Amino acid sequence: DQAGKSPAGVRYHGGDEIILQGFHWNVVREAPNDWYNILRQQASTIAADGFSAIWMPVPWRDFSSWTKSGGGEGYFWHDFNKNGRYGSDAQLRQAAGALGGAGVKVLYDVVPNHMNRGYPDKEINLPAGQGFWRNDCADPGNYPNDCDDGDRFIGGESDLNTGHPQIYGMFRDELANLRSGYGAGGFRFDFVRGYAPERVDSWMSDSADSSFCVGELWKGPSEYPSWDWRNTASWQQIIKDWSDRAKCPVFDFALKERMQNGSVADWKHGLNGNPDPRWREVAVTFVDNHDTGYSPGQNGGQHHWALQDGLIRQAYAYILTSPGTPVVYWSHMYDWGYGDFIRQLIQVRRTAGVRADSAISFHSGYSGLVATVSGSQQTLVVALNSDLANPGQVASGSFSEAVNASNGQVRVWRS
Numbered sequence: 001d002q003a004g005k006s007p008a009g010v011r012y013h014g015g016d017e018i019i020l021q022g023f024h025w026n027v028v029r030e031a032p033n034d035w036y037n038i039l040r041q042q043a044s045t046i047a048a049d050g051f052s053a054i055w056m057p058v059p060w061r062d063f064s065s066w067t068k069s070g071g072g073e074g075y076f077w078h079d080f081n082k083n084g085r086y087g088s089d090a091q092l093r094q095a096a097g098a099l100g101g102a103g104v105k106v107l108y109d110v111v112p113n114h115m116n117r118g119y120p121d122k123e124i125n126l127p128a129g130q131g132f133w134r135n136d137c138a139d140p141g142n143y144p145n146d147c148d149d150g151d152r153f154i155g156g157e158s159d160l161n162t163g164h165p166q167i168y169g170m171f172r173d174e175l176a177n178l179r180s181g182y183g184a185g186g187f188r189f190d191f192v193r194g195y196a197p198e199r200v201d202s203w204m205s206d207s208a209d210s211s212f213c214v215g216e217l218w219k220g221p222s223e224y225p226s227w228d229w230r231n232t233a234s235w236q237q238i239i240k241d242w243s244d245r246a247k248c249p250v251f252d253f254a255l256k257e258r259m260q261n262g263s264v265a266d267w268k269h270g271l272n273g274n275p276d277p278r279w280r281e282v283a284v285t286f287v288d289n290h291d292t293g294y295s296p297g298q299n300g301g302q303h304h305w306a307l308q309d310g311l312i313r314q315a316y317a318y319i320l321t322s323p324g325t326p327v328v329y330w331s332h333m334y335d336w337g338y339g340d341f342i343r344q345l346i347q348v349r350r351t352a353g354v355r356a357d358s359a360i361s362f363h364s365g366y367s368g369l370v371a372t373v374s375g376s377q378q379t380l381v382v383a384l385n386s387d388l389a390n391p392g393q394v395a396s397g398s399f400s401e402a403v404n405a406s407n408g409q410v411r412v413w414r415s
């Protein structure tokens with residue numbers, strides 16, 4: 001694995017990451033107090049499957065509960081104590097050690113925007129009236145106020161003033177803690193619409209400057225005020241701007257929006273397809289996550305924006321053969337039987353030398369999506385839901401078949 005920032009200083013850790021999302025939404029219910037144990041036991045398999053990194057659940061304990069029903073998953077944590085619903089502090093250290101020992105960098109989900117302010121038994125107790133909270137200031141709506149330079153979570157009563165020096169420092173120090181005893185190789189920042197992107201740059205500079213990061217900005221143009229340039233911008237432009245200011249890769253919700261609403265041909269309009277390498281190399285691509293996708297267990301998980309099963313193989317073939325940095329969802333890989341297919345695609349990606357900045361060209365004249373990808377070692381031809389007959393119709397050189405699945409709806413050839 002190679003380290004390094006992008007030419008623009010963006011923390012894509014060499015551009016060669018292949019990431020596993022290491023949980024689904026219902027883990028705390030399906031494997032009570034046992035997930036870190038499971039990850040420890042699976043560390044060698046995860047490495048053998050070809051992942052360079054794993055996105056871990058939020059490590060800060062969360063004993064919240066609401067009624068659909070949920071709670072405890074990490075996104076309404078009450079303090080930084082690691083003895084939460086995924087396992088104990090000791091078990092987390094064992095899992096992170098096993099994953100790192102196997103060559104899988106450990107990326108923690110971190111949630112700076114808010115905390116479970118009302119939880120009665122916690123280590124972090126911030127009073128009102130000192131500027132620590134969004135609602136220490138007038139709060140007329142879901143947009144920045146004088147105590148919170150980003151959006152708010154629901155009603156905002158639990159949003160922290162992350163720009164207050166004490167609160168900034170609290171998170172800075174906890175990121176350093178995670179990088180030390182918990183072996184962090186980077187971070188996934190939750191709800192990045194909730195606080196300034198420049199604060200993510202600062203936190204990473206202070207506590208993990210050479211690590212990998214990714215921000216979750218899931219916010220469409222119509223969610224911005226009519227006078228904001230983003231209101232008339234593309235999904236790509238919105239997430240790219242965040243990445244520029246955080247100096248962090250960003251989840252490719254532009255690609256996800258095309259996968260949900262467009263045709264397969266239109267998947268070329270994700271951030272990861274952009275002809276400018278400074279744009280596509282900051283995209284972190286995915287098929288589904290714990291919010292968008294199903295999960296095993298109660299209510300099928302959240303399934304806010306799930307990709308239908310007739311496109312899952314196509315979507316994994318696209319993200320695993322293309323630029324940007326791909327993320328594989330736990331349940332596709334290890335619950336629902338796509339593992340062998342995904343393993344094969346990961347090997348294709350590695351053997352071809354595809355990285356986040358590899359060139360990708362899209363070809364006209366066929367149905368579906370037809371792309372040529374320039375890896376450092378091989379050129380790939382990728383044909384998804386297409387009437388393309390063979391790679392010589394669209395590329396020079398000698399090719400052999402690498403993938404042929406779903407009655408030819410997924411085909412990949414390599415030079």
Ligand SMILES: C[C@H]1O[C@H](O[C@H]2[C@H](O)[C@@H](O)[C@@H](O[C@H]3[C@H](O)[C@@H](O)[C@H](O)O[C@@H]3CO)O[C@@H]2CO)[C@H](O)[C@@H](O)[C@@H]1N[C@H]1C=C(CO)[C@@H](O[C@H]2O[C@H](CO)[C@@H](O[C@H]3O[C@H](C)[C@@H](N[C@H]4C=C(CO)[C@@H](O)[C@H](O)[C@H]4O)[C@H](O)[C@H]3O)[C@H](O)[C@H]2O)[C@H](O)[C@H]1O
Pocket residue numbers: 064066071072075076111153154155156157158159190191192193216217218219220290291302304305
């Ligand atoms: C879940 C995601 O929501 C938002 O994305 C929106 C997106 O902006 C919108 O365009 C839309 O996108 C898609 C949409 O999915 C698709 O169907 C549609 O066709 O197209 C849309 C795009 O155009 O919808 C997305 C999902 O709602 C955000 O932008 C995104 O960042 C977030 N994902 C991350 C954020 C959180 C929060 O940490 C996590 O949420 C998770 O953890 C939260 C905390 O436990 C869960 O919240 C629960 O617990 C809270 C304490 C509770 N809130 C209490 C607290 C307070 C405060 O004192 C009170 O004001 C409330 O009244 C009270 O009830 C919630 O009601 C309850 O639902 C949340 O449901 C869950 O998703 C996710 O797992 C993480 O990945």
Ligand SMILES: [Ca+2]
Pocket residue numbers: 001002003004012013014015016017
């Ligand atoms: Ca790397």
Ligand SMILES: [Ca+2]
Pocket residue numbers: 113134148149150151152153159160193194195
């Ligand atoms: Ca906020």
